[PDB]
Design a protein around this ligand. Structure first.
Ligand code: B7N
Length: 307
């Protein structure tokens, strides 16, 4: 399989329960877990990395893990997640046209990696005008975009970043920029945030590495109290709402040369004219780290900036 073309064991610093560092009990739990799924006639997504993510999410409770994995497969099938990339490719022209319009309003882009080799992801929310946004897209569509990215992450970003890092990468480093949002709108989209949380928590376990929230308005901490109800404790412990010293905290986790200038780093697009909201820069663009999976498609069509 493709798995033989990139590291399947995490770095030596990874906590037990991860690929390459299991206790005897865990390693035994994993074999039993796979056996049960194999008996249920499951074929795909049964590799160590995937299975350990579900096991970790359920603290290695085999039956709870089986139940979680079964429901995930169910959803993947009904949601169309197993063919989300293919279907997008067959509709690229139309979908790209609408995505281009949404990107400028709601920047979503990866820009290199963090110090551990994790794909570095950025989102900027301050330019969103809900009214204008609801005229060009729907929450439904934004969720499907999210799901598609989850698939692109596992398909293209992980193999490449793992080959570069020298070890298996299973998570991302996210920076949520809230500069310019109204605490009021934060409350207003609680519903969508819940939907995002449901899909991620339930179908994409152990995919969060580091998650920073910067430039949040005063009072945000209170609004966040309403988000925590639908986030597992493990997830909440990965979320960090930074203050005025955010650049210094980001510099502790991300190479200065990989962090955009406005966030405290020195990274600049090769062509200062290009926009980060049409960019997709990282190891998965480096021919040296792209494998049999091929190169990731261009989500922003012709405007896609890969440098
Ligand atoms: C309409 C625009 C709204 C965009 C507002 C959208 C904001 C969302 C922003 C970005 C999208 C998030 C992408 C997340 C990338 C990380 C990968 C990922 O999916 O991680 C997953 C995390 O799932 C999530 O919860 C994702 C949702 C994150 C919510 C972040 C809080 C949002 C902050 C709100 C800001 C306010 C918005 C301002 C509004 C202004 C707009 C005018 C898996 O977690 P992990 O710890 O890896 O494993 C879990 C496992 O899974 C559980 O089962 C187990 O029980 C548990 O023990 C663990 O094993």
């Amino acid at each position: 399989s493709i798995l033989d073309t990139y590291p399947q064991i995490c770095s030596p610093n990874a906590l037990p329960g991860t690929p390459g560092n299991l206790t005897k009990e865990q390693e035994e739990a994993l074999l039993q877990f796979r056996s049960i799924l194999l008996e249920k006639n499951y074929k795909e997504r049964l590799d160590d990395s995937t299975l350990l993510r579900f096991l970790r999410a359920r603290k290695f409770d085999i039956n709870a893990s089986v139940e979680m994995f079964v429901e995930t497969e169910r959803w993947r099938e009904e949601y169309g997640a197993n063919t989300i990339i293919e279907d997008y490719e067959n509709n690229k022209e139309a979908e790209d046209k609408e995505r281009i319009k949404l990107a400028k309003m709601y920047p979503q882009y990866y820009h290199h990696v963090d110090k551990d080799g994790r794909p570095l992801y950025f989102e900027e929310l301050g330019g969103i005008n809900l009214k204008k946004m609801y005229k060009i897209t729907t929450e439904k569509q934004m969720l499907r975009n999210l799901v598609k990215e989850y698939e692109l992450f596992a398909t293209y970003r992980v193999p490449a970043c793992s080959r570069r890092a020298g070890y298996l990468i299973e998570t991302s480093c996210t920076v949520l920029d809230l500069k310019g949002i109204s605490l009021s709108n934060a409350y207003h989209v609680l519903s969508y945030i819940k939907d995002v949380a449901d899909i991620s928590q339930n179908y994409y376990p152990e995919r969060m590495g580091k998650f920073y929230i910067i430039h949040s308005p005063f009072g945000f901490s209170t609004m966040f109290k309403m988000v925590k109800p639908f986030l597992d404790p493990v997830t909440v412990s990965k979320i960090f709402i930074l203050g005025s010293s955010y650049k210094k905290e980001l510099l502790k986790q991300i190479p200065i040369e990989n962090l955009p200038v406005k966030y405290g780093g020195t990274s600049v697009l090769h062509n200062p004219n290009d926009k980060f909201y049409y960019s997709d820069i990282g190891p998965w663009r480096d021919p040296r780290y792209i494998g049999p999976e091929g190169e990731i498609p261009n989500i922003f069509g012709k405007f896609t900036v890969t440098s």
